[PDB]
Write a protein that binds this ligand. Structure first.
Ligand SMILES: CCCCCCCCCCCC(=O)OC[C@H](COP(=O)(O)OCC[N+](C)(C)C)OC(=O)CCCCCCCCCCC
Ligand SMILES: CCCCCCCCCCCC(=O)OC[C@H](COP(=O)(O)OCC[N+](C)(C)C)OC(=O)CCCCCCCCCCC
Ligand SMILES: CCCCCCCCCCCC(=O)OC[C@H](COP(=O)(O)OCC[N+](C)(C)C)OC(=O)CCCCCCCCCCC
Ligand SMILES: CCCCCCCCCCCC(=O)OC[C@H](COP(=O)(O)OCC[N+](C)(C)C)OC(=O)CCCCCCCCCCC
Ligand SMILES: CCCCCCCCCCCC(=O)OC[C@H](COP(=O)(O)OCC[N+](C)(C)C)OC(=O)CCCCCCCCCCC
Ligand SMILES: CCCCCCCCCCCC(=O)OC[C@H](COP(=O)(O)OCC[N+](C)(C)C)OC(=O)CCCCCCCCCCC
Ligand SMILES: CCCCCCCCCCCC(=O)OC[C@H](COP(=O)(O)OCC[N+](C)(C)C)OC(=O)CCCCCCCCCCC
Ligand SMILES: CCCCCCCCCCCC(=O)OC[C@H](COP(=O)(O)OCC[N+](C)(C)C)OC(=O)CCCCCCCCCCC
Ligand SMILES: CCCCCCCCCCCC(=O)OC[C@H](COP(=O)(O)OCC[N+](C)(C)C)OC(=O)CCCCCCCCCCC
Ligand SMILES: CCCCCCCCCCCC(=O)OC[C@H](COP(=O)(O)OCC[N+](C)(C)C)OC(=O)CCCCCCCCCCC
Ligand SMILES: CCCCCCCCCC(=O)OC[C@H](COP(=O)(O)OCC[N+](C)(C)C)OC(=O)CCCCCCCCC
Ligand SMILES: CCCCCCCCCC(=O)OC[C@H](COP(=O)(O)OCC[N+](C)(C)C)OC(=O)CCCCCCCCC
Ligand SMILES: CCCCCCCCCC(=O)OC[C@H](COP(=O)(O)OCC[N+](C)(C)C)OC(=O)CCCCCCCCC
Ligand SMILES: CCCCCCCCCC(=O)OC[C@H](COP(=O)(O)OCC[N+](C)(C)C)OC(=O)CCCCCCCCC
Ligand SMILES: CCCCCC(=O)OC[C@H](COP(=O)(O)OCC[N+](C)(C)C)OC(=O)CCCCC
Ligand SMILES: CCCCCC(=O)OC[C@H](COP(=O)(O)OCC[N+](C)(C)C)OC(=O)CCCCC
Ligand SMILES: [Cu+2]
Ligand SMILES: [Cu+2]
Ligand SMILES: [Cu+2]
Ligand SMILES: [Cu+2]
Ligand SMILES: [Cu+2]
Lengths: 236, 382, 241, 236, 123, 51, 52
């Protein structure tokens, strides 16, 4: 067994959902999605905002609660094969988290860049703002916290102590979501132009830096792999 | 000497100097050479250059080879920065007193607060004599004629040398004893507390008390002597009087303007419409420190620099006298070696290929009208 | 090792002289470049030496090196002339340049381009350092002395240059007339950050208020640069830079 | 022997060469040296720039290569007298370096200050810029790196480990040379005036601070002197 | 990619991190404009557009309407009275190389912290 | 404002000063793609050598 | 011109006149691009009912 086909599903769910979201915004970006006060815009995009927020809060609660309720209490009694299997499942969680980071912080972020760079901003909940700030950002926040809970509750290495770099990796990209307030406080206030390199955007930049903690995260996961699944073979 | 480096379009459209006249060409030490003329602040001021809200009328010479005795804009002395209005014409008069012998390229430059220097045309002025003959007497309000060349120099030297001597004594007091390695080892190996002990602390108190008392006594003496002092005078002079030029009776519309790359010639097409009741003839085209003259219309008598003058560099396709009320389209070609010597042809390298200049239309009676032209400058390669 | 103790003393003296040369001239370079690229303009000319900007800025940017050099020298050798050697090094560099470049290469008068005097501040800083070896007490009191004695220290030199003169209808001090006459091609009048007067300037307080602000900021800069110098005194060896 | 008359030559070469350079710039500062586009300026100063750059690169390569090829491999077999002689030679190297620091960072730096403060800047390679940025700066960079190589390859103290403060002393003043780009990017761009206290110049200021590492350098050299040439006599 | 390759090769060769920050950062700053010159070179061909000189890139920016990006937001070379000769690109390249040295030095240590494997027991 | 037709029919010819009528819709696109793909290929080779 | 010199509580005193903004405005003082017409009294001993 070891690494199962959970990785394929983990990548495929994100790919399918995000391709559908891209199709949705490419269909309703204009023509019910251009004007923020039209009656059809509330039915096509204000509904997007409400359904996605409710579903994301519910899914975050359910996922974190399940991963915390099913936590392994007897971590001392852990065979090295099962520990290596859990290490691979945690690495699958990290792969899903990285895919979510990409989809949220590159694709939809620059999609919003194109959106507001080629139109005039009409509200705080434009189509691309709904797609990026309130869908993709909460999705990778949920995935990062779920991976944190899984690692802490299953991996003997990551248990008995909260990992500082991996905590930074889970929290910094999370702080981008409350940083959306600075984005809007910036465009409505200090930056009355569609400048996209102005300091109002440095809020995401600072917490875009905090995603560099994946370096410490991955060296820590390698150390976790190198306890039971050390081999050997390596270093001989 | 500062020009030929600035952007060509920027030299073309910042400030237009004309009617320049130098009182002397071969000056002696202490003798006065005066630069007069009119400068027109261009309407289409480049946005990258801050508007001349705080502009200082300077002179571009290598060091102070001439002391700027007087300088006026309008009719009043302007020793400090002044505010210039975009589109207005001001006349200036800079009085220079020779100080250093040699051949000096005296330029008339203008400095703007956030836009840098605008060097105007410069004329080679020769000075004969010796620098030691130079005398700069100035009479203060307290009744003392002082020569600025040596005034306060002795007091400055004495005070600086005295303070340096005090510092050298303070350093040498510790330099007498061994300095680096013994003291370092004493500090490292346990408490030193012997490298600084009486009467070293007494000498420290002596130095500190001497410094405080010397400074206080010197300040009191410099308040008794020179009892009347004023702060440094500063502040921009607003409300310069601009020249009240009559409205020109000639309107020139530039329908495209090109220059060959590489080349020394500028091709440009105008639709001159003459109002009033006199026949005009285009005689001169001043673009950027360079005057392209039409020898058949106007000949220079003001001693303009030879390298900046095109005596017959301006060729008009149809330069017959233009009857009043008549409008006509002519091809004006300003070709001269200065166009490449002063790197006017490097406007291709500039991020704004637009030109500006002054056209001088002369009548049969001799009076002239100064009309402005500005248009995009399109290079030609075929 | 060495043959005798006398040869050890002579070797120590030779080392002391050469290392004093090194300290002096490395400071002459670095401190001078720091000063001239932070306070050069007010130091280059006599019509820049005003009562707000000049005395405000000069001590703030000139306590930088003396603080660090004192932090090293006093701590390591109990030698209380780090500030003095920095100040005399800066003065030597400035005067050599004024005489051989400002007045030698060009011909700007010395009474026009003379530098500022700093030895009183250096001496106060060093004496208040050795007396009461407390570094905090030095940063608190000697920095006040350095900030406060700058303008009275330079007053004997620039006092004759502030005599009122009427120049072709306008009131001018001698320093203003020098700046107006001697043409600085690259330095127009408007670059001059001098006291231009304010609607908040109450009474005759421009010089003392600026002096006290400079003394306070000198306290802060001394405190920062003491620790910056504490790092430069390090003897670490990175095995793999 | 011990300290030889190499110190006199070390000071005299700098003094003679820099007095000749000062005479050269005082003769050709004006009149072939005022206008940067005159045919004579290219023959008097553009040639200065090319010859000095070629000679400096060649001399740096030769000096560093020689000092690294003639490195002492058997540092354990070092009599204290020879170690003290090498310490004195290293102190002579430091004296030469300090003389070069002065000549480059005070004399020619304020000479350039006078130059561009009393004329209008005409190019990136004015006479004083050629004299300071491209002659004196590379000269003290060469001397500092040569002293570094000598200390590391001869002194038992400075070997077995790269000295952090002395590395800072050799590199910080070196970073002033690439900081010349900020000087020109400053005057052509952000500072369109001859202001000499403006932030475009803070680049040299920051690395002027790094020359304070001579403090750690000299305490380290004193420690090096105090191994074999300790005496004694001091501390007794 | 040219800057990346220079940075990586000057890193592995001479594994000195300081040497990398000093030389590879110069390479990264200096090879940016020559690296992109083949791509943007065809876009700088002069064109006269209804009376005004324009490059191809200027015509594209003028034609293709960017509703949110007007022309004045463009921080581009607008010319200066201190721009001497043909030096805008090289001087900017050298300034970028120097600031790349500084930013590399800062971010090397910032990354050194992100590589940490610490475990705060009570965040 | 209503527009009828197809986007592929759009033509934007511009004549440069050097004597070349270029269509802005596709001008320099091939050169851009080639250079970007070449540099990406070099980077991918550099990574794969260690991969 | 001051309407009253000896006012009672709640009674209205009105200040009128003309002010001329000087042409040679000092450069250290920002131009009156944003100027507010105030009244200088110790605290609010008079409430500014109207100002034109
Ligand atoms: C981490 C937890 C993330 C939770 C995020 C939840 C977001 C849900 C989407 C709201 C859209 C909206 O706008 O609202 C609801 C929309 C409003 O569209 P309509 O007008 O009814 O048109 C008819 C619908 N079409 C236009 C899509 C055809 O209709 C719906 O019911 C459809 C929502 C389908 C979502 C599930 C499919 C996702 C792709 C498959 C791989 C997973
Ligand atoms: C319980 C789950 C479902 C609800 C979830 C919340 C969805 C939004 C509700 C809007 C209600 C309202 O009043 O609209 C919002 C009112 C606007 O005023 P309006 O008159 O409505 O304008 C009509 C505008 N339209 C037509 C587009 C709706 O203010 C705002 O712009 C609020 C802007 C906040 C920006 C910063 C948010 C940062 C979040 C950080 C997270 C860590
Ligand atoms: C303890 C430390 C925390 C301090 C932070 C508090 C927030 C500061 C609020 C400023 C209000 C003010 O001071 O004034 C408000 C000024 C007044 O300008 P205006 O005349 O309206 O200009 C009109 C121009 N418009 C029309 C575009 C506004 O607007 C500003 O220029 C806003 C300056 C931005 C400051 C916020 C930066 C936040 C940093 C984020 C990087 C992560
Ligand atoms: C360690 C701390 C030692 C303190 C040593 C003080 C020496 C005496 C100074 C006399 C100054 C003077 O004469 O008056 C103030 C004048 C400026 O006056 P001005 O408005 O420009 O007028 C110019 C015309 N004059 C010259 C006729 C006046 O000078 C200064 O700018 C110095 C300001 C700071 C002085 C601080 C004194 C208070 C005690 C500080 C310590 C607690
Ligand atoms: C704990 C700190 C205690 C410090 C006490 C001050 C001692 C003053 C010594 C005499 C100085 C002198 O006589 O100098 C006065 C001059 C005045 O300047 P002027 O009017 O422009 O011209 C010069 C006119 N003469 C020549 C007649 C002097 O300088 C000053 O402005 C300094 C005075 C302000 C000091 C404010 C200190 C507040 C301390 C608060 C905490 C208790
Ligand atoms: C760390 C390594 C540093 C390397 C720096 C090398 C810089 C060389 C100078 C270039 C000058 C220039 O401008 O170029 C070369 C100049 C051009 O002048 P010319 O027109 O031929 O006039 C004739 C020459 N006069 C005007 C000097 C008389 O002529 C030369 O051949 C002379 C260069 C002599 C340099 C060697 C003497 C230095 C002083 C003695 C103590 C060492
Ligand atoms: C320790 C560091 C030593 C560095 C020495 C420099 C070697 C130059 C290699 C050839 C480059 C080239 O040929 O390029 C020149 C172009 C000129 O640009 P252009 O005129 O606008 O147009 C292009 C015109 N062509 C196509 C004819 C080239 O680019 C530059 O501006 C780079 C030249 C300035 C370098 C300044 C370095 C100063 C070093 C000081 C310490 C000794
Ligand atoms: C990771 C962190 C690295 C960031 C550094 C990147 C360099 C920043 C480039 C600024 C370009 C910009 O943003 O805009 C460019 C603005 C636009 O102004 P303008 O309208 O042309 O003004 C016209 C005025 N002129 C004519 C004088 C230009 O010019 C500026 O004001 C330049 C501000 C200086 C910023 C550089 C400071 C470098 C610090 C050096 C100290 C060691
Ligand atoms: C191989 C050894 C010999 C060569 C060494 C290099 C000498 C200079 C070559 C210039 C070639 C050229 O093209 O000139 C330079 C072109 C100008 O354009 P121009 O049309 O030539 O203008 C004519 C100008 N004159 C008449 C004065 C020559 O750009 C530049 O201003 C480049 C400016 C770069 C400034 C930042 C440099 C920082 C260096 C940092 C080191 C660590
Ligand atoms: C690790 C370091 C490797 C260095 C590799 C250098 C490759 C050759 C560059 C030729 C540049 C050119 O052709 O000239 C300069 C041009 C800009 O010219 P422009 O004024 O905009 O004119 C545009 C018209 N052109 C294209 C006909 C000229 O390009 C640049 O902006 C690059 C500036 C930095 C070049 C640095 C070279 C000096 C050596 C540096 C290392 C010591
Ligand atoms: C839109 C919401 C979708 C939520 C999907 C959650 C799937 C269930 C999570 C989970 O428990 O892990 C699934 C796999 C395999 O790990 P398991 O073995 O199930 O974990 C329990 C370990 N234990 C048996 C020792 C007690 O571990 C993984 O690596 C799962 C990664 C799947 C993609 C995550 C998508 C998250 C979107 C917010
Ligand atoms: C402008 C700011 C002033 C510069 C001062 C910053 C100095 C930072 C300290 C530093 O460089 O750390 C060196 C380490 C490499 O360590 P090692 O080479 O393993 O040395 C072992 C001992 N040590 C860890 C204590 C160093 O980290 C490294 O990776 C080596 C880099 C060394 C570069 C320091 C040279 C600075 C010159 C400007
Ligand atoms: C313009 C270029 C001039 C380059 C001059 C280089 C002179 C030769 C350098 C050198 O090797 O050192 C000379 C002296 C004495 O040290 P040496 O004993 O020669 O060093 C070798 C040590 N060893 C015998 C144990 C193998 O050590 C010193 O202290 C020499 C200092 C001389 C001044 C340095 C000027 C540098 C200018 C770039
Ligand atoms: C934007 C700036 C980047 C963020 C990086 C800052 C990290 C600061 C380091 C830190 O958090 O220290 C944790 C201590 C609590 O210590 P303990 O929980 O006792 O852990 C014991 C071991 N330890 C003391 C070394 C941590 O201090 C505490 O009170 C716990 C707070 C932990 C918060 C760190 C999470 C940062 C996520 C943004
Ligand atoms: C690694 C990220 C891949 C992002 C690809 C993407 O955004 O695809 C949408 C785009 C949409 O253009 P098109 O294929 O023409 O289909 C248009 C359908 N809408 C308008 C709904 C997007 O093209 C595709 O759907 C290609 C499928 C790629 C699978 C990895
Ligand atoms: C510690 C730095 C000494 C700097 C002295 C200097 O720059 O000297 C040049 C200057 C030039 O003025 P001057 O002596 O009149 O000779 C003029 C020759 N030129 C114009 C070539 C400089 O004066 C001297 O040559 C005196 C010799 C001092 C020896 C330490
Ligand atoms: Cu934004
Ligand atoms: Cu000239
Ligand atoms: Cu004009
Ligand atoms: Cu500079
Ligand atoms: Cu009035």
């Amino acid at each position: 067994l070891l690494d199962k086909k959970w990785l394929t599903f983990a990548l495929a769910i994100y790919t399918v959902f995000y391709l559908w979201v891209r199709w949705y915004e490419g269909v309703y970006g204009w023509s019910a999605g251009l004007d923020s006060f039209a009656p059809e815009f509330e039915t096509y995009w204000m509904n997007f905002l409400y359904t996605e927020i409710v579903l994301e809060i519910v899914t975050a609660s359910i996922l974190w609660g399940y991963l915390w309720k099913t936590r392994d209490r007897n971590l001392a009694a852990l065979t090295p094969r099962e520990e290596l299997r859990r290490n691979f499942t945690h690495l699958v969680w990290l792969v899903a988290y990285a895919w979510a980071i990409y989809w949220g912080a590159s694709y939809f972020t620059e999609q919003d860049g194109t959106w507001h760079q080629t139109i005039v901003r009409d509200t705080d909940f434009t189509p691309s703002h709904i797609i990026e700030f309130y869908l993709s950002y909460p999705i990778y926040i949920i995935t990062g916290f779920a991976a944190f809970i899984y690692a802490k509750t299953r991996l003997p290495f990551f248990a008995k102590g909260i990992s500082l770099p991996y905590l930074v990796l889970v929290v910094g990209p999370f702080m981008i979501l409350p940083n959306v307030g600075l984005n809007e406080w910036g465009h409505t206030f200090w930056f009355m132009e569609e400048l996209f390199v102005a300091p109002l955007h440095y809020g995401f930049v600072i917490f875009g830096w905090l995603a560099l903690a994946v370096m410490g995260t991955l060296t820590q996961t390698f150390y976790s792999f190198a306890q039971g699944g050390l081999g050997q073979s390596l270093c001989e | 000497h500062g020009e030929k480096s600035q952007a060509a379009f920027m030299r073309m459209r910042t400030i237009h100097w004309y009617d320049l006249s130098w009182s002397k060409e071969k000056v002696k030490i202490n003798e006065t050479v005066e630069i007069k003329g009119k400068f027109h602040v261009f309407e289409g001021w480049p946005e990258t250059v801050d508007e001349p809200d705080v502009a200082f009328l300077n002179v571009g010479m290598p060091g102070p080879v001439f002391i700027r005795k007087e300088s006026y804009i309008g009719g009043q002395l302007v020793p400090r920065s002044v505010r210039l209005e975009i589109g207005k014409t001001y006349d200036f008069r800079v009085v220079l007193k020779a100080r250093r012998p040699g051949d000096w390229h005296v330029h008339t430059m203008m400095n703007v607060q956030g836009g840098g220097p605008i060097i105007g045309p410069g004329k080679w002025i020769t000075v004969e004599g010796s620098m030691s003959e130079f005398r700069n007497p100035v009479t203060t309000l307290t009744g003392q004629t002082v020569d600025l060349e040596n005034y306060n120099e002795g007091n400055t030297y004495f005070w600086h040398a005295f303070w340096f001597a005090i510092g050298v004594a303070w350093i040498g007091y510790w330099s007498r004893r061994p300095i680096f390695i013994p003291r370092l080892l004493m500090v490292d190996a346990g408490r030193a507390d012997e490298l600084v002990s009486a009467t070293d602390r007494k000498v420290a108190m002596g130095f500190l008390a001497a410094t405080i008392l010397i400074v206080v006594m010197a300040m009191s003496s410099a308040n008794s002597k020179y009892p009347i002092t004023i702060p440094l005078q500063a502040g921009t002079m607003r409300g310069m009087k601009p020249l009240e030029l009559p409205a020109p009776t000639v309107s020139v519309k530039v329908e495209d303007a090109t220059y060959r790359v590489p080349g020394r010639a500028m091709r440009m097409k105008l639709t001159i419409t003459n109002h009033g009741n006199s026949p005009i003839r285009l005689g001169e085209f001043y673009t950027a420190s360079v005057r392209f003259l039409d020898s058949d219309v106007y000949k220079d008598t003001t001693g303009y620099p030879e390298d900046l003058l095109a005596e017959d560099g301006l060729s008009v396709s149809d330069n017959s006298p233009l009857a009043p009320g008549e409008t006509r389209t002519v091809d004006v070609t300003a070709s001269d070696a200065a166009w490449e010597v002063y790197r006017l042809s490097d406007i291709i390298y500039d991020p704004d290929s637009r030109f500006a200049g002054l056209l001088f239309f002369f009548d049969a009676t001799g009076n002239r009208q100064v009309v402005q032209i500005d248009a995009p400058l399109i290079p030609s390669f075929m | 090792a060495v043959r005798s103790h006398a040869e050890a003393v002579q070797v120590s003296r030779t080392i002391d002289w050469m290392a004093l040369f090194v300290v002096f001239f490395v400071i002459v370079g670095s401190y001078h470049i720091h000063a001239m690229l932070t306070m050069g303009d007010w130091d280059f000319w006599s019509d820049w030496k005003d009562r707000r900007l000049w005395v405000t800025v000069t001590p703030i940017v000139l306590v930088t090196f003396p603080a660090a050099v004192q932090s090293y020298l006093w701590e390591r050798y109990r030698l209380p002339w780090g500030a003095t050697v920095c100040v005399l090094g800066l003065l030597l560099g400035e005067w050599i340049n004024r005489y051989f470049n400002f007045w030698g290469w060009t011909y700007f008068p010395i009474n026009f381009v003379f530098p500022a005097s700093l030895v009183p501040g250096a001496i106060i800083l060093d004496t208040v350092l050795m007396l009461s070896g407390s570094y905090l007490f030095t940063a608190i009191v000697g920095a006040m002395g350095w900030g406060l004695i700058f303008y009275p220290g330079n007053w004997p030199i620039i006092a004759p240059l502030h005599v009122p003169v009427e120049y072709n209808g306008m009131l001018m001090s001698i320093a203003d007339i020098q700046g107006y006459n001697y043409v600085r091609t690259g330095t127009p009048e408007y670059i001059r950050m001098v006291e231009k007067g304010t609607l908040r300037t109450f009474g005759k307080d421009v010089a003392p208020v600026s002096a006290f602000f400079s003394a306070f900021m000198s306290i802060l800069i001394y405190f920062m640069w003491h620790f910056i110098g504490r790092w430069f005194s390090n003897e670490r060896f990175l095995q793999s830079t």
